[PDB]
Design a protein around this ligand. Sequence first.
Ligand SMILES: NC(=O)c1ccc[n+]([C@@H]2O[C@H](COP(=O)([O-])OP(=O)(O)OC[C@H]3O[C@@H](n4cnc5c(N)ncnc54)[C@H](O)[C@@H]3O)[C@@H](O)[C@H]2O)c1
Length: 401
Amino acid sequence: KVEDFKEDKEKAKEWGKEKEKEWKLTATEKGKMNNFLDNKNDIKTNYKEITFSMAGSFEDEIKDLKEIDKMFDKTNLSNSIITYKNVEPTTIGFNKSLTEGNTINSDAMAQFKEQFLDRDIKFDSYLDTHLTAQQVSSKERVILKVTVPSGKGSTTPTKAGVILNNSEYKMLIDNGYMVHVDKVSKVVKKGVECLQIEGTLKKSLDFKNDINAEAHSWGMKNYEEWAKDLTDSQREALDGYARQDYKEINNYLRNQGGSGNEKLDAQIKNISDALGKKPIPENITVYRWCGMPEFGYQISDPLPSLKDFEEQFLNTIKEDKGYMSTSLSSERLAAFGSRKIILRLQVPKGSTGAYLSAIGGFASEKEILLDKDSKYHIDKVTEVIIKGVKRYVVDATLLTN
Ligand SMILES: NC(=O)c1ccc[n+]([C@@H]2O[C@H](COP(=O)([O-])OP(=O)(O)OC[C@H]3O[C@@H](n4cnc5c(N)ncnc54)[C@H](O)[C@@H]3O)[C@@H](O)[C@H]2O)c1
């Protein structure tokens, strides 16, 4: 069943007052949740940076995040409901001028619908929405009308709950969900034009900087068996790849037409056959810190303007003839802690790849290796300043064949 209090604040208050009970939270926890919400100590302000930070940094914040994680771990969302939240266009990666006064540009909408309609929107942190439409604030001209599926008698429980913040009951949705845009239209609230995104939640695992070390377990829990059932041919090739062969193999595939080397072709065949035995069991999020050359730039070039970057990659499909290595953790590691482009990749259930870390040995850390000839769709680009330097987080959806 689907609720929607629209603009009835009282009847929503009752509802929020009731689900506020279902969430198994002590007053101590509630306080801790509100601190993050009211951005105590700039934790909400630095959250995004935090998720892409190097280990050791933001210790105390991490300790609060680990406590807040354990809280969504107790969400018993029983009823489906329609939440409302207004946001500035920049917050969801829309970087084109959206309004001109109380009016919607027009080219803006075209551009807007082209970028999001029927697409998934990935957010940086826990989404907090309202139970009733909110007055269009300053520049917060995008109205998000997200339908939150209770998914009670459903397989996976909807990790969402109601909290009482600032004299108001609000919906709090865990990191692991994106908003699939179902419909986009122009609406008018009190003489002011805004864009309204009607969408539904869509689950997608996202370990972020893996603060509770849940990534490796998820990986093993799903690919330990796959690892065991590999042939010694496959086990060995994958071990060669991981150890050092990857440099020679990727180069061959990316630059030498992937032809002309009997030896490699054979190893490549085992690797790919291994990689296909078990499609990714569910929608997951992987990460990858990229070097400028990977996006057509020079090793010593600064990031181009955010505008130029969108003109070049926004809405395009980037390919890779080689094998793409990604990670379940967005954690910044010394090996490449200074890359300026971070890929936030959505791997849909059924993608061709495997959690390589399952083979142990020379294997890498928390690695999801995608099969060669991969292709993904760049959905949106946003900025994040990590320890001083500006980086570009490029959200994309993997195309599954
Ligand atoms: N960088 C990451 O975020 C990350 C994440 C998980 C695992 N790894 C690991 O690091 C090791 C090396 O791989 P890597 O992923 O860091 O790569 P890398 O970026 O260091 O690869 C070096 C080269 O591959 C390139 N490349 C060339 N054509 C490309 C194309 N068409 N598409 C994509 N890249 C292209 C780069 O431009 C560069 O020339 C592996 O052993 C792997 O386990 C890295």
